[PDB]
Design a binder for this molecule. Structure first.
Ligand SMILES: C[C@@H]1CC[C@@]2(OC1)O[C@H]1C[C@H]3[C@@H]4CC=C5C[C@@H](OCCC(CO[C@H]6O[C@H](CO)[C@@H](O[C@H]7O[C@H](CO)[C@@H](O)[C@H](O)[C@H]7O)[C@H](O)[C@H]6O)CO[C@H]6O[C@H](CO)[C@@H](O[C@H]7O[C@H](CO)[C@@H](O)[C@H](O)[C@H]7O)[C@H](O)[C@H]6O)CC[C@]5(C)[C@H]4CC[C@]3(C)[C@H]1[C@@H]2C
Ligand SMILES: CCCCCCCCCCCCCCCCCC(=O)O[C@@H](COC(=O)CCCCCCCCCCCCCCC)COP(=O)(O)OCC[N+](C)(C)C
Ligand SMILES: CCCCCCCCCCCCCCCCCC(=O)O[C@@H](COC(=O)CCCCCCCCCCCCCCC)COP(=O)(O)OC[C@H](O)CO
Ligand SMILES: CCCCCCCCCCCCCCCCCC(=O)O[C@@H](COC(=O)CCCCCCCCCCCCCCC)COP(=O)(O)OC[C@H](O)CO
Ligand SMILES: CCCCCCCCCCCCCCCCCC(=O)O[C@@H](COC(=O)CCCCCCCCCCCCCCC)COP(=O)(O)OC[C@H](O)CO
Ligand SMILES: CCCCCCCCCCCCCCCCCCCC(=O)O[C@H](COC(=O)CCCCCCCCCCCCCC)COP(=O)(O)OCCN
Ligand SMILES: CCCCCCCCCCCCCCCCCCCC(=O)O[C@H](COC(=O)CCCCCCCCCCCCCC)COP(=O)(O)OCCN
Ligand SMILES: CCCCCCCCCCCCCCCCCCCC(=O)O[C@H](COC(=O)CCCCCCCCCCCCCC)COP(=O)(O)OCCN
Ligand SMILES: CCCCCCCCCCCCCCCCCCCC(=O)O[C@H](COC(=O)CCCCCCCCCCCCCC)COP(=O)(O)OCCN
Ligand SMILES: CCCCCCCCCCCCCCCCCCCC(=O)O[C@H](COC(=O)CCCCCCCCCCCCCC)COP(=O)(O)OCCN
Ligand SMILES: CCCCCCCCCCCCCCCCCCCC(=O)O[C@H](COC(=O)CCCCCCCCCCCCCC)COP(=O)(O)OCCN
Ligand SMILES: COC1=C(OC)C(=O)C(C/C=C(\C)CC/C=C(\C)CC/C=C(/C)CC/C=C(\C)CCC=C(C)C)=C(C)C1=O
Lengths: 125, 68, 100, 174, 488, 75, 76, 269
């Protein structure tokens, strides 16, 4: 049911970072297009494009961070501990959520909530 | 109530329910897509209609006009 | 290569309609025009397939779809007219009162 | 090559439909798109549909759009907006649609690569179908009113709805 | 020759009666002699009569609707499933019309064309149910849609009604174009549009590696159009705005009949056709999204109409779970859910229309209703508890099946989502009961008593909601019959 | 005992009264309507019982055909 | 009783679901352009996930997919 | 199988008594306060005496269910439901029938403002709770336990003393409904194995240790909320304090017992 792969933990982390950056770029593009432009920018085109690209880059950066740290900690847990379960990956989800989303949110309760939420998701998986 | 009769309908319920528990579960296993449903006559409408219009101008083999 | 070229023509018309929806957030008249462009592209798809497949069904449906396009444009432009009449303007900020 | 010319004209005219600042100009470019479409239809041998696209799309629908848009007298301030900030979202949506949807026929309908040999001699001619050829018009008319008449009548109902709605929504009798 | 048309006697009658009413209305509405009388109620009564006669003709001629099936085969297909679906559609249309007379006379909505457009849309939905080809399906859908566009904008001087119409026409036309594109792709890939031909071509292969991307994307685009029509998330946001901005009788009519017609279409297209697991996954994900979004957004609402719109979105999520699981019991449960939701929606909109005589708008406007009209507050409370799915009310069936399928298809995330969304729904449904029974506002709104039509309809739907589970056998048997008739 | 006629008559009478109450009218405002409602309720309940029997009869044959079609697989 | 259990219970649950319902209601912005954009996005998502997910599995995983979706809730 | 009992006083009539009282009270004008009071009181007292008689004819030697009677639901007879009591449920029926007249008597002085709705709500509660205690079927136990939520919600919200009754009623309803949904999940889990929800059969089927563990957890979810067990007990103080006096009496004296009855009746055996 799972024997179609070649694996490689470093490859896993790199590819996770790349996939996270792609998803974050798309997500930032969507977010930037949904919003309105400031009234003082209605008659000028360039800064709107600049703000959209900045949102793209910021969201690509943060989502790449989550998508890399998640798999990295997951593999660094199932390698040193040398076991396969949902416990490995729940720790990774928690650390990714806490670290990145609390760095962005600048609050510890948000970090704890994000880490707990990311674990229950990866736990279900 | 009468203890003898009360304890006897109690046996009929179980004996009848342990051996009656098989019928309904067979309906739940009935396929929603029957075997060869497209074989059923309702689904072969074109096979019976199209021969009736096979000589209609607009769908004839071109050689039919040369020989008729 | 004929069939791929005829199909990509209609396809560019359809993608142009999609882009017109995407690029016209303050201009809902052009949004209606983009929807017509998509309908034209679908109509062309039916006609090309009819020839390629040597089958008449694509042609009957193309005519009926033209009828639908006509009725759609008539009713849509009536709704545009009454919206404009109520507001005195066609700007999108005056058709955003229903929300939540 | 000829399909390249017509497709290029259609591409530019459609971009003008969706990007012209003045809506009257958009209606006029739309009319150019329908002319190019009619040209393609003539290439397909469908002269009835080629003419009907002129009669209905340009002669009736575009005229309706032009009458309405011209009397609106839209000011550009009411519908202006910069589109430079949409280039990325159009890039992803366009590309995904481009990669999927311009090439959807390729696996099912594989093109015949034109070779350095005259394949025209392998065209087989059946004269039996050429004794009494049918126009596009009469082939369509053989079917609309007899074998598929119900759809014809439902379309009539659709037109009746259009008439009623046009009256009820806009009529102000003097 | 004449006897062939026995298969379309119901439709012929209703179309002819609609023409008669159009002529009657236009001739006498313009009459100086009669001083331009309003004819909305007169034409409404005559059209209710016409709908009931159509129902009689259809129900009493069940075998005759299948006469000359080979001659009619390339136009439509009538069977037991279409029989019962059309009967239910006519019953819903009759109820909706009966709920409109107080609106006609007290608001003074004098336009009789409203009734004519409703009747023509009913004709369109009748043809939708019996459609057996992509072309016929599209044409009937378009007729129905154009009628709705016009009636959504019927208050043509209202900002709200004109906004509703504009949003509806634009988003409806967009979705229809997407669906038509899907139809064109399927035709180009298979050379067929008749449902039988599509079934034969597509069966036995699904995705056998060499899958027709043309067939796969045609199905996807058609599914997108269908999901727009059933107001499934993420193709839903037209529905709350249109429901709120349209005249309330329009909102009541849109909440019921199109769902019946389009679900008949969806069953006969997908269930009877064949791409397979992909499409059931489509409806699975859209069901989950619809349940979650409907619950949360409904919890946000302060106005009655918007609350009911989001409630309907959540319930179509619950219903589509049945389509997703792909079993005879799944189809049966979908039909049971549609029937019960329709009856509950009719009850709720009868109350809403009764309260519109005093311009009910906010949930808080219901304050002290248990004092100013006790039996009305109880009736509305029964509807809310039924919406929440509290047993033994009729609404409990949909919840029971949702969890039955969650443990039948083997889906525990779905069960978790159902539990959470059911609790959220119960909260925002009992908030209304709290407003009518527990609150003590400083200013009360006194409501005018409802007319006889709405009181009778409310009385019957309230007995059904309370007492259905005492005698549910006829619905169960008829829905099992219909589910089976799709394939045999 | 508890026949469909009696249940239907009681439901029809209840329907008329509930309708009167909803309109804030006295329970027995138009009594001939209560009689009409009892009659209609009795008729509707009896017809529903008969229709239920007929529905079960048709479902039986239809399930029989489904079972035969399924059993054709193992031939 | 009135502390952690209330926060990890009715008090906290009511707060978060109120904020979430708040956020979801704002999606219904009243702008017809948002509603069309949503339909286009849903159509694009349909094509992307359900047909163009053949060679993506080499670089992606389902875990990361659902994680990034949930993580989006904690933005700004 | 019709399991009709031979004894004259049976369970169905005791179910029907407060139902008939409620229907009669539906149609009596609120001006006739004395008539409403007396009719409600007398219906409740007759139900209490009926339950006392049921005690009299109890047979204290059998392990079986006594006074077992059956009620058909569909002519197909696949789903048919049974009522019966034993030595674990008898006194709870008696306690319910005894407490309800007490509730009508506590609000005697304020009945002019309470109205017939107060008595009707308490009679409906009585009917539902007696049903719950008398059910030999998991599914019907479910259906009739959830039903009491509606009249209890009304009782707390309408006749509670102060505005905190709003929050109290919301919390009562939502906690109890969450637990009930968990036990619905357990019921369906059981039905998939057995094809039935009849208690007598489930007492004679064998469940795997694994699926026993998981079904027991699902039952515990409902019952621990009902008992209440910590930490899902916090709804109880709010609800039992904000309710009117008779509402508190019914909540503490009967409704609390339903979780322990569920443990005794389904989970332990
Ligand atoms: C009233 C108002 C006013 C406005 C308006 O209406 C409204 O006014 C209306 C007036 C309209 C115009 C009216 C008229 C045309 C001409 C049409 O253009 C004909 C083009 C077609 C016909 O072209 C040839 O057709 C025959 C050859 O095919 C020639 O026959 C020879 O060959 C026979 C066989 O050996 C011998 O037996 C004969 O003896 C021998 O003579 C014939 O002479 C010649 O005409 C199509 O041709 C192409 O198609 C080929 C297939 O795709 C392409 O093949 C290529 O691809 C292949 C792979 O696919 C490869 O294998 C190939 O190697 C590789 O070459 C290639 O590009 C090219 O051939 C283009 C459209 C247009 C401008 C309309 C525009 C719209 C309007 C302005 C309307 C406007 C809207
Ligand atoms: C057990 C079910 C599950 C839980 C759900 C419970 C849902 C209800 C919540 C219970 C809490 C208390 C509810 C209190 C309601 C009782 C009060 C009530 O409804 O009385 C109504 C009575 O409402 C009704 O009309 C109910 C009629 C329903 C009929 C059902 C009976 C069917 C057969 C009976 C046949 C006719 C009568 C036979 C004897 C004459 C009086 O309405 P008003 O608005 O006060 O005045 C009406 C106007 N006028 C008196 C002048 C006519
Ligand atoms: C056009 C813009 C697309 C993103 C471009 C950003 C730079 C490249 C990032 C990237 O790698 O794109 C990934 C895009 O990542 C995603 O789409 C995110 C996955 C979905 C996340 C959310 C799931 C929604 C359900 C796909 O990975 P790939 O490029 O390695 O694929 C190549 C292919 O496998 C071999 O030919
Ligand atoms: C699945 C097994 C369990 C997993 C582990 C669960 C336990 C881990 C904790 C998970 C929730 C993190 C709690 C974060 C606490 C800080 C949140 C906070 O700031 O408090 C706010 C309250 O928010 C919360 O506490 C959230 C409580 C969440 C509890 C449950 C969430 C919903 C769970 C049910 C939905 C999912 C159900 C299915 C799950 C499988 C109130 O803020 P205030 O207005 O009072 O301002 C002052 C504040 O203190 C700042 O200084
Ligand atoms: C919300 C309920 C918890 C999540 C839903 C859930 O886990 O579903 C189970 C519901 O049970 C519960 O989890 C109740 C626990 C709720 C309290 C925690 C039933 O599914 P299953 O695991 O039994 O299917 C496998 C079966 O053994 C094979 O047939
Ligand atoms: C279950 C395990 C995690 C518990 C959920 C904890 C959520 C707490 C929280 O505040 O997160 C908010 C909601 O969560 C979410 O974004 C949704 C998480 C799933 C909730 C259940 C549905 C995000 O938003 P926020 O409240 O932090 O932002 C405004 C801050 N002032
Ligand atoms: C806190 C706990 C949160 C846990 C979330 C985990 C999500 C994973 C769900 C999952 O496992 O995938 C399938 C469903 O996912 C899905 O259905 C996709 C997630 C839900 C889709 C729609 C979500 C939209 C929510 C609406 C508000 C969002 C607003 C965003 C603007 C379930 O597995 P299976 O049941 O298919 O097994 C098939 C066997 N037969
Ligand atoms: C199933 C659960 C248990 C249900 C029990 C059912 C029992 C049977 C029903 C018994 C009915 C008892 C009452 C019978 C006497 C009333 C006779 C009505 C007299 C009448 O002419 O009413 C007219 C109005 O039409 C009307 O008011 C009648 C139309 C009202 C709507 C009725 C349904 C019509 C459409 C069908 C909808 C089906 C929906 C299904 C989805 C005029 O009245 P007026 O003189 O007072 O003046 C009104 C001011 N304009
Ligand atoms: C699709 C169709 C949907 C219809 C849904 C079912 C109708 C609406 C149900 C809600 C109102 C009726 C509540 C049920 C009445 C309660 C007593 C039930 C009962 O056992 O009486 C039998 C049914 O009467 C009745 O017929 C019930 C009254 C008519 C309603 C008569 O007993 P029976 O012997 O005549 O019938 C063969 C039964 N063993
Ligand atoms: C056999 C018992 C049941 C028989 C019922 C009558 C025969 C069935 C015929 C259909 C009856 C359907 C119900 C008729 C009334 C429907 C609602 C009408 C109410 C309405 O708004 O219009 C009223 C017309 O009166 C009217 O419509 C009633 C006009 C006269 C009928 C009353 C006589 C009924 C005879 C009952 C038995 C007689 C025994 C001797 C044969 C005007 O109201 P309004 O200004 O006149 O006054 C009312 C004081 N609120
Ligand atoms: C291994 C350890 C396991 C431990 C055991 C865990 C078991 C679960 C424990 C937690 C139980 C939570 C039960 C939910 C109770 C919520 C009660 C809140 C209701 C309340 O008091 O006030 C409302 C809150 O506002 C609101 O808006 C509330 C919105 C409704 C929220 C209900 C959401 C519950 C969904 C289920 C979540 C738990 C999932 C469990 C799998 C109304 O206030 P207002 O003033 O704003 O309203 C307008 C007023 N008319
Ligand atoms: C409170 O913070 C904020 C957000 O955050 C909630 C935001 O977003 C935005 C702005 C950006 C938005 C709204 C983009 C989101 C739009 C989308 C995803 C388009 C789709 C439309 C809808 C209604 C979503 C429905 C789709 C669902 C639930 C899933 C799709 C379907 C299936 C899985 C089957 C802003 C300004 C913001 O300040």
């Amino acid at each position: 049911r799972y024997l179609e792969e070649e694996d490689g933990p470093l490859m896993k982390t790199i590819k996770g970072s790349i996939t996270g950056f792609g998803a974050g770029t798309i997500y930032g593009t969507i977010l930037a297009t949904w919003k309105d432009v400031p009234r003082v920018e209605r008659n000028v085109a360039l800064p709107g494009l600049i703000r959209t690209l900045k949102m793209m880059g910021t969201h690509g950066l943060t989502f790449a961070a989550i998508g890399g740290v998640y798999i990295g900690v997951e593999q660094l847990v199932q390698n040193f501990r040398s076991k396969r379960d949902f416990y490995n990956g729940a720790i990774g989800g928690f650390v990714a959520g806490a670290s990145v989303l609390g760095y962005r949110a600048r609050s510890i309760p948000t970090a704890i909530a994000a880490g707990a939420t990311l674990a229950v998701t990866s736990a279900l998986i | 109530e009468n203890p003898e009769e009360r304890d006897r309908k109690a046996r009929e319920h179980i004996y009848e329910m342990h051996e009656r528990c098989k019928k309904i579960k067979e309906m739940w296993a009935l396929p929603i897509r029957p075997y060869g449903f497209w074989t059923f006559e309702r689904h072969n409408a074109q096979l019976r209609w199209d021969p009736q219009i096979s000589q209609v101008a607009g769908r004839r083999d071109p050689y039919d006009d040369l020989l008729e | 290569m004929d069939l791929i070229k005829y199909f990509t023509f209609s396809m560019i018309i359809f993608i142009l309609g999609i882009w017109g929806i995407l690029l016209n957030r303050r201009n809902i008249l052009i949004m209606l025009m983009s929807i017509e462009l998509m309908l034209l592209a679908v109509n062309l798809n039916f006609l090309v397939f009819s020839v390629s497949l040597d089958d008449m069904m694509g042609q009957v449906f193309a005519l009926l779809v033209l009828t639908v396009a006509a009725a759609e444009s008539a009713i849509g432009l009536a709704i545009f007219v009454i919206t404009f009449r109520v507001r005195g303007t066609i700007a999108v900020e005056f058709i955003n009162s229903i929300q939540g | 090559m000829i399909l390249s010319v017509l497709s290029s004209l259609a591409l530019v005219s459609g971009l003008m439909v969706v990007r012209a600042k003045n809506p009257v100009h958009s209606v006029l470019f739309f009319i150019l798109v329908f002319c190019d479409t009619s040209g393609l239809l003539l290439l397909l041998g469908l002269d009835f549909f080629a003419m009907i696209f002129l009669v209905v799309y340009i002669g009736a629908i575009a005229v309706l759009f032009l009458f309405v848009v011209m009397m609106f007298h839209i000011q550009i301030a009411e519908i202006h907006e910069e589109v430079l900030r949409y280039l990325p979202v159009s890039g992803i949506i366009g590309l995904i649609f481009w990669w999927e949807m311009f090439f959807i026929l390729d696996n099912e309908s594989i093109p015949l690569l034109p070779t350095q040999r005259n394949t025209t001699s392998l065209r087989y001619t059946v004269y039996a179908g050429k004794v009494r050829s049918w126009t596009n018009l009469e082939t369509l008319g053989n079917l609309l009113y007899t074998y598929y008449f119900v759809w014809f009548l439902v379309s009539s109902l659709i037109l009746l709805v259009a008439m009623i709605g046009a009256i009820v929504l806009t009529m102000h009798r003097t | 020759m004449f006897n062939l048309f026995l298969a379309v006697f119901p439709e012929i009658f209703i179309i002819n009666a609609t023409f008669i009413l159009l002529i009657h209305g236009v001739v006498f509405s313009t009459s100086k002699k009669y001083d331009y009388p309003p004819l909305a109620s007169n034409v409404g009564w005559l059209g209710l009569l016409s709908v009931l006669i159509t129902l009689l003709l259809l129900a009493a001629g069940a075998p005759l609707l299948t006469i000359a099936h080979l001659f009619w085969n390339n136009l439509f297909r009538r069977d037991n499933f279409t029989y019962f679906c059309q009967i239910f559609l006519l019953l819903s249309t009759a109820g909706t019309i009966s709920m409109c007379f107080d609106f006609f006379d007290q608001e003074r909505f004098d336009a009789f064309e409203f009734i004519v457009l409703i009747l023509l849309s009913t004709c369109g939905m009748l043809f939708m149910i019996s459609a057996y080809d992509l072309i016929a399906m599209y044409l009937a859908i378009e007729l129905q849609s154009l009628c709705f566009y016009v009636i959504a904008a019927s208050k043509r001087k209202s900002e709200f009604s004109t906004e509703a119409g504009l949003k509806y026409l634009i988003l409806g036309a967009f979705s229809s174009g997407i669906l038509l594109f899907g139809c064109s792709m399927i035709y180009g890939s298979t050379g067929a549009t008749h449902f039988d031909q599509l079934a034969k071509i597509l069966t036995g292969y699904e995705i056998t590696g060499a899958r027709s991307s043309g067939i796969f994307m045609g199905i996807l685009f058609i599914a997108v159009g269908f999901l727009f029509k059933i107001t499934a998330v993420p193709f839903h946001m037209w529905a709350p705005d249109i429901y709120e901005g349209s005249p309330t009788p329009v909102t009541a009519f849109l909440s019921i009949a199109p769902k019946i017609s389009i679900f008949a279409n969806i069953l006969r297209v997908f269930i009877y056709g064949s791409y397979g697991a992909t499409l059931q996954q489509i409806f699975f994900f859209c069901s989950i999204a619809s349940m979650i979004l409907g619950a949360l957004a409904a919890m946000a609402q302060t106005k009655v109409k918007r609350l009911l719109a989001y409630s309907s979105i959540g319930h179509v999520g619950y219903i589509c779970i049945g389509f997703s699981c792909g079993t005879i019991e799944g189809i049966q449960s979908l039909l049971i859910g549609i029937f019960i939701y329709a009856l509950m929606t009719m009850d709720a909109f009868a109350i809403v229309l009764a309260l519109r005589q005093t311009r009910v708008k906010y949930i808080a406007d219901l304050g002290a209703l248990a004092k100013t009209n006790p039996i009305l507050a109880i009736t509305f409370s029964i509807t809310m508890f039924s919406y929440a799915g509290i047993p033994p009310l009729a609404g409990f069936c949909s919840k029971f099946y949702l969890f039955f399928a969650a443990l039948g298809c083997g889906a525990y995330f779905l069960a978790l989502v159902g539990v959470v969304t059911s609790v959220i729904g119960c909260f925002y449904y009992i908030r209304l009961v709290k407003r009518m029974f527990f609150d003590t506002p400083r200013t009360w709104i006194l409501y005018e008593p409802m007319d006889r039509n709405k009181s009778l309809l409310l009385a019957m739907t309230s007995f059904f909601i309370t007492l259905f589970l005492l005698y549910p056998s006829p619905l169960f048997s008829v829905t099992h019959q219909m589910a089976l008739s799709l394939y045999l | 005992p508890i026949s469909a006629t009696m249940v239907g008559a009681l439901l029809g009478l209840g329907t008329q009264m509930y309708s009167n109450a909803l309109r804030k009218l006295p329970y027995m405002r138009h009594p001939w309507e209560h009689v009409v409602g009892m009659g209609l309720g009795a008729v509707f309940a009896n017809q529903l019982v008969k229709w239920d029997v007929k529905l079960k009869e048709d479902l039986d044959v239809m399930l029989a055909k489904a079972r035969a079609a399924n059993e054709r697989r193992y031939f | 009783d009135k502390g952690a259990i209330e926060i990890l219970g009715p008090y906290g649950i009511s707060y978060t679901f109120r904020r979430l319902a708040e956020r979801i209601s704002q999606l219904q912005s009243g702008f017809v352009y948002h509603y069309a954009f949503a339909m286009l996005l849903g159509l694009t998502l349909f094509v992307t996930f359900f047909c163009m997910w053949d060679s993506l599995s080499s670089w992606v995983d389902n875990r990361l997919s659902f994680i990034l979706i949930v993580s989006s809730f904690y933005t700004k | 199988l019709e399991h009709f009992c031979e004894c004259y006083f049976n369970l169905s009539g005791l179910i029907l008594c407060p139902v008939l009282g409620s229907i009669i009270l539906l149609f009596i004008p609120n001006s006739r306060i004395r008539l409403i009071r007396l009719i409600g009181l007398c219906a409740s007292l007759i139900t209490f005496l009926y339950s006392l008689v049921l005690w009299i004819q109890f047979d204290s030697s059998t392990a079986k269910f006594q006074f077992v009677e059956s009620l058909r639901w569909l002519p197909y007879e696949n789903i048919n439901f049974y009522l019966g009591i034993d030595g674990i449920s008898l006194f709870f029926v008696i306690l319910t029938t005894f407490l309800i007249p007490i509730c009508i008597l506590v609000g005697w002085s304020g009945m002019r403002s309470y109205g017939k709705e107060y008595i009707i709500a308490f009679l409906i509660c009585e009917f539902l709770m007696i049903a719950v205690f008398c059910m030999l079927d998991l599914l019907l136990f479910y259906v009739f336990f959830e039903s009491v939520l509606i009249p209890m919600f009304i009782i707390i919200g309408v006749w509670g003393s102060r505005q905190r009754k709003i929050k109290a009623a919301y919390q009562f309803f939502l906690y109890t409904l969450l637990g009930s949904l968990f036990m619905l999940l357990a019921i369906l889990l059981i039905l998939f194995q057995t094809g039935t929800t009849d208690l007598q059969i489930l007492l004679t089927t064998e469940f795997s240790e694994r699926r026993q563990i998981f079904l027991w957890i699902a039952f515990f979810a409902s019952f621990a909320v009902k008992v209440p067990m910590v930490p899902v007990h916090i709804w109880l103080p709010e609800a039992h304090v904000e309710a009117p006096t008779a509402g508190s009496v019914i909540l503490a004296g009967i409704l609390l017992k339903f979780g322990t009855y569920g443990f005794l009746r389904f989970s332990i055996p």
